[PDB]
Enzyme design. Structure first.
Site, PDB file in Angstrom:
ATOM      1  N   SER A 118     -10.432  -1.389  -2.713  1.00  0.00           N
ATOM      2  CA  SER A 118      -9.556  -2.250  -3.231  1.00  0.00           C
ATOM      3  C   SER A 118     -10.413  -3.650  -2.857  1.00  0.00           C
ATOM      4  O   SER A 118      -8.852  -4.083  -3.843  1.00  0.00           O
ATOM      5  CB  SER A 118      -8.185  -1.920  -2.762  1.00  0.00           C
ATOM      6  OG  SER A 118      -7.606  -1.062  -3.307  1.00  0.00           O
ATOM      7  N   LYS A 165     -10.660  -4.675  -6.262  1.00  0.00           N
ATOM      8  CA  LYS A 165      -9.680  -5.222  -7.200  1.00  0.00           C
ATOM      9  C   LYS A 165     -10.186  -7.253  -7.331  1.00  0.00           C
ATOM     10  O   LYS A 165      -9.764  -7.590  -9.057  1.00  0.00           O
ATOM     11  CB  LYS A 165      -8.472  -5.547  -6.166  1.00  0.00           C
ATOM     12  CG  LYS A 165      -8.088  -3.546  -6.639  1.00  0.00           C
ATOM     13  CD  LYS A 165      -6.037  -3.598  -6.453  1.00  0.00           C
ATOM     14  CE  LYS A 165      -5.760  -2.371  -7.232  1.00  0.00           C
ATOM     15  NZ  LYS A 165      -6.645  -1.484  -6.194  1.00  0.00           N
ATOM     16  N   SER A 186      -1.788  -3.823  -3.651  1.00  0.00           N
ATOM     17  CA  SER A 186      -3.114  -2.506  -4.497  1.00  0.00           C
ATOM     18  C   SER A 186      -2.886  -1.333  -5.393  1.00  0.00           C
ATOM     19  O   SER A 186      -2.844  -0.374  -4.483  1.00  0.00           O
ATOM     20  CB  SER A 186      -3.476  -2.067  -2.947  1.00  0.00           C
ATOM     21  OG  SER A 186      -3.986  -2.996  -2.012  1.00  0.00           O
ATOM     22  N   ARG A 218      -6.313  -4.369  10.739  1.00  0.00           N
ATOM     23  CA  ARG A 218      -6.831  -5.400   9.451  1.00  0.00           C
ATOM     24  C   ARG A 218      -6.279  -6.382   9.929  1.00  0.00           C
ATOM     25  O   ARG A 218      -7.894  -7.739  10.201  1.00  0.00           O
ATOM     26  CB  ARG A 218      -6.853  -4.350   7.943  1.00  0.00           C
ATOM     27  CG  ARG A 218      -7.739  -3.399   7.709  1.00  0.00           C
ATOM     28  CD  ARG A 218      -7.614  -2.941   6.783  1.00  0.00           C
ATOM     29  NE  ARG A 218      -5.748  -2.811   5.882  1.00  0.00           N
ATOM     30  CZ  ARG A 218      -5.094  -2.602   5.026  1.00  0.00           C
ATOM     31  NH1 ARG A 218      -5.866  -2.253   4.069  1.00  0.00           N
ATOM     32  NH2 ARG A 218      -3.904  -2.413   4.681  1.00  0.00           N
TER      33      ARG A 218
HETATM   34  O1  LIG Z   1      -6.393   6.496  -3.903  1.00  0.00           O
HETATM   35  S1  LIG Z   1      -6.071   6.885  -2.671  1.00  0.00           S
HETATM   36  O2  LIG Z   1      -4.983   7.109  -2.163  1.00  0.00           O
HETATM   37  O3  LIG Z   1      -7.521   7.134  -1.867  1.00  0.00           O
HETATM   38  C1  LIG Z   1      -6.152   5.073  -2.405  1.00  0.00           C
HETATM   39  C2  LIG Z   1      -6.338   3.562  -3.248  1.00  0.00           C
HETATM   40  C3  LIG Z   1      -5.973   2.807  -2.677  1.00  0.00           C
HETATM   41  C4  LIG Z   1      -5.513   1.984  -1.401  1.00  0.00           C
HETATM   42  C5  LIG Z   1      -5.308   0.836  -0.750  1.00  0.00           C
HETATM   43  C6  LIG Z   1      -4.285   0.725   0.290  1.00  0.00           C
HETATM   44  S2  LIG Z   1      -4.496  -0.808   0.726  1.00  0.00           S
HETATM   45  O4  LIG Z   1      -2.883  -1.455   0.939  1.00  0.00           O
HETATM   46  O5  LIG Z   1      -5.136  -0.769   2.135  1.00  0.00           O
HETATM   47  O6  LIG Z   1      -5.214  -2.202  -0.309  1.00  0.00           O
HETATM   48  C7  LIG Z   1      -3.686   1.937   1.011  1.00  0.00           C
HETATM   49  C8  LIG Z   1      -3.901   2.757   0.366  1.00  0.00           C
HETATM   50  C9  LIG Z   1      -4.680   3.066  -0.586  1.00  0.00           C
HETATM   51  C10 LIG Z   1      -5.031   4.436  -1.079  1.00  0.00           C
END
Ligand SMILES: O=S(=O)(O)c1ccc2cc(S(=O)(=O)O)ccc2c1
Ligand SMILES: O=S(=O)(O)c1ccc2cc(S(=O)(=O)O)ccc2c1
Ligand SMILES: [Cl-]
Ligand code: NA
Ligand code: NA
Ligand code: NA
Ligand code: NA
Lengths: 242, 242
Positions: A47, A50, A95, A227
């Site tokens: 992400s 983005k 996100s 993080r």
């Molecule tokens: O599509 S997934 O479930 O692999 C996915 C995609 C983006 C994500 C971003 C975050 S974030 O909050 O770290 O940006 C957390 C879990 C996520 C899971």
């Protein structure tokens, strides 16, 4: 240019973890990291993609500004904050992958590939699915490559309009007080090993800016807070933030 | 449109002072205050004039961008933070008058007065020195008039470029966390009675923005911190920030 400081491993060791933090001091043009090798190993952006995605969508008019509302499609997903209407500010803050998946569909394979080439972003490869390649396709980017890209964005030097770059830098606003401003973007790469979490961005001081890009091993979602936690411990150790 | 909520005066009398706080719900298009008469009373803007001053200087090329450095002139003044180099970001954060006095001198009386008429700003009168009229001249603006001005700024419909307005809205950044973002500007009028303190801006939420303008009696500089403190107490009482 680059100087290694393994002192920072203790912050990763303390939390049963392993990672890399990369710092760049803009004024003195000097970089710092705890692991030179890992600082240059390329991972899925997840992400954090983005940031380029928003720049592309804004420049092409897919998103006219940061108030345009992308309405929820009604399908209830696991992350509760995704199940609502969003604009670009809140979409990036949380996100919201579905919102950026329709962006990628409107941008299309050709324009996405062309923009990433001009951005010099990572390996510039959009192999895989049009709306998921940053999560499970062929694109790769190192932490230092994230800093190169981010420094272009900070100085409005990327090939898209100055307006697009100012709107994204507003959307990256994570934290601000009397001491510093943090513009940054989180990422979590779960679909392809090795599972890692990202935090890239910079810290605006009064008379300097510190660019940072970190990633770390992330086997489950429970450690995601590290993080920001580990990064701030590194920023505190270098007396950047109090 | 407006409605009085005199419950807030307990936040002023608790700290032995008087004042007004004016809120404006953008979504609902409804206004609130603890004193509609003081809400419409026009005072010297003091350093809350740095918001329109910055727009005019940016639109006219007096200031190239938020990164341009304006060197200290060497004269050591009473506020330590003024005795150093600054850019637009920090010059606004610390209300560095000498930096903005140079801006005004280069803008000049004629363009300053046309621009203030275009902004519909207060009583639009710049009588006095062009480099100090917002501190001891004839310009006067009310709390509700600040909110009209700030609403135009938020919506990019002030009569300057969209670029200039985005930059000023960046430089207004005061505070940001996971719950809200505050873009505001402080002010202390102490050259002409009544000595009053200003805090004007807005609070960006996920689904809303709340504009606020407040002023209060400030006989000594000791009470300056109650500008933000009392405003945050009102915002908390109105379930606007936790
Ligand atoms: O599509 S997934 O479930 O692999 C996915 C995609 C983006 C994500 C971003 C975050 S974030 O909050 O770290 O940006 C957390 C879990 C996520 C899971
Ligand atoms: O020039 S004065 O000494 O009257 C002056 C001008 C502006 C000021 C702004 C502030 S601020 O609190 O608005 O930053 C405080 C004191 C000030 C004094
Ligand atoms: Cl901002
Ligand atoms: Na955001
Ligand atoms: Na992945
Ligand atoms: Na300019
Ligand atoms: Na006054």
């Amino acid at each position: 240019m680059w100087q290694e400081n393994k002192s920072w491993n203790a912050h990763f060791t303390e939390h049963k973890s392993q990672g890399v933090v990369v710092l760049w001091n803009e004024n003195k043009q000097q970089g710092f990291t705890n692991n030179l090798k890992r600082a240059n190993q390329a991972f899925l952006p997840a992400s954090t993609f983005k940031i380029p995605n928003s720049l592309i969508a804004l420049d092409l008019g897919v998103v006219k500004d940061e108030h345009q509302v992308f309405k929820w499609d009604g399908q209830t997903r696991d992350i509760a904050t995704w199940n609502r209407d969003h604009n670009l500010i809140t979409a990036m803050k949380y996100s919201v992958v579905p919102v950026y998946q329709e962006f990628a569909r409107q941008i299309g394979e050709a324009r996405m590939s062309k923009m990433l080439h001009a951005f010099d972003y990572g390996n510039e490869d959009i192999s895989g699915n049009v709306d998921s390649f940053w999560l499970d396709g062929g694109i790769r980017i190192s932490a230092t490559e994230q800093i190169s890209f981010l420094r272009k964005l900070y100085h409005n030097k990327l090939h898209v309009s100055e307006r697009s770059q100012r709107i994204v830098k507003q959307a990256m606003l994570t934290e601000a007080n009397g001491d510093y401003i943090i513009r940054a973007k989180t990422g979590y790469s779960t679909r392809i090993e090795p599972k890692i979490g990202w935090w890239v961005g910079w810290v605006e001081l009064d008379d300097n800016v510190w660019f940072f890009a970190m990633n770390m091993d992330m086997p489950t979602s429970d450690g995601l807070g590290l993080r920001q936690a580990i990064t701030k411990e590194v920023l505190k150790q270098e007396k950047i933030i109090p």
